[PDB]
Amino acid sequence: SVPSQKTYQGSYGFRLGFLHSGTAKSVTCTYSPALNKLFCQLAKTCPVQLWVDSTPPPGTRVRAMAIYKQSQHMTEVVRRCPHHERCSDSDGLAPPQHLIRVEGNLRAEYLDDRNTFRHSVVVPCEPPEVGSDCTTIHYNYMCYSSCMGGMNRRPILTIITLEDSSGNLLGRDSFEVRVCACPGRDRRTEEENLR
Ligand SMILES: CNCc1ccc2c(c1)c1ccccc1n2CCF
Numbered sequence: 001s002v003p004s005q006k007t008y009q010g011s012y013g014f015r016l017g018f019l020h021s022g023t024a025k026s027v028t029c030t031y032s033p034a035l036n037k038l039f040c041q042l043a044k045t046c047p048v049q050l051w052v053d054s055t056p057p058p059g060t061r062v063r064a065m066a067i068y069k070q071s072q073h074m075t076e077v078v079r080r081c082p083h084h085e086r087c088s089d090s091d092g093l094a095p096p097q098h099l100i101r102v103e104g105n106l107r108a109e110y111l112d113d114r115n116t117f118r119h120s121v122v123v124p125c126e127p128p129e130v131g132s133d134c135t136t137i138h139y140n141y142m143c144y145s146s147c148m149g150g151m152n153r154r155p156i157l158t159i160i161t162l163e164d165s166s167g168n169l170l171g172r173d174s175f176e177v178r179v180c181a182c183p184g185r186d187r188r189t190e191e192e193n194l195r
């Protein structure tokens with residue numbers, strides 16, 4: 001009915017990482033550690049790092065799913081709004097209803113859950129390239145937080161799960177997301193409000 005959001009490093013020490021992009025007016029994606037919140041523009045690249053302490057088995061996958069943050073909305077499926085689901089911006093793989101896409105990975109799979117109706121996108125867990133210490137997934141968020149008939153100004157969380165080949169839980173992390181026109185200004189405002 002509601003997916004768990006409990007942080008769980010599991011046997012492999014799984015956790016996320018984010019770049020340090022700053023808050024200039026021109027920034028298109030920026031992460032606030034103090035808020036555990038990603039601020040991004042519509043349909044722009046959001047780099048999310050995956051870190052582990054030890055190598056998970058072949059066939060491990062990484063899934064992303066959005067849920068509403070507020071308890072009174074958590075049972076409602078997060079989906080694109082009535083405008084964006086019809087705007088013919090398909091990448092040829094993501095269903096037009098899905099808020100979260102993975103960019104540039106032909107092995108991405110998109111799930112409409114047959115029981116919960118929730119959307120998710122899952123990719124194989126790949127090791128870092130030679131010379132790198134982590135792997136990065138590039139996500140896109142395909143509606144604004146403010147879209148009427150969709151998120152409608154309600155905050156969302158993204159839950160990232162590390163899964164075995166059967167879909168069993170190996171690790172979990174999460175972060176709040178705001179999709180907005182000016183991520184740098186909004187991050188500065190919300191960090192000031194918190195302080
Ligand atoms: C020093 N570098 C550690 C590190 C960081 C991230 C890593 C790995 C190793 C690793 C090894 C095998 C398969 C996937 C792997 N990931 C991605 C999932 F977090």
Ligand SMILES: [Zn+2]
Pocket residue numbers: 080081082083084085142143144147148150
């Ligand atoms: Zn929309």
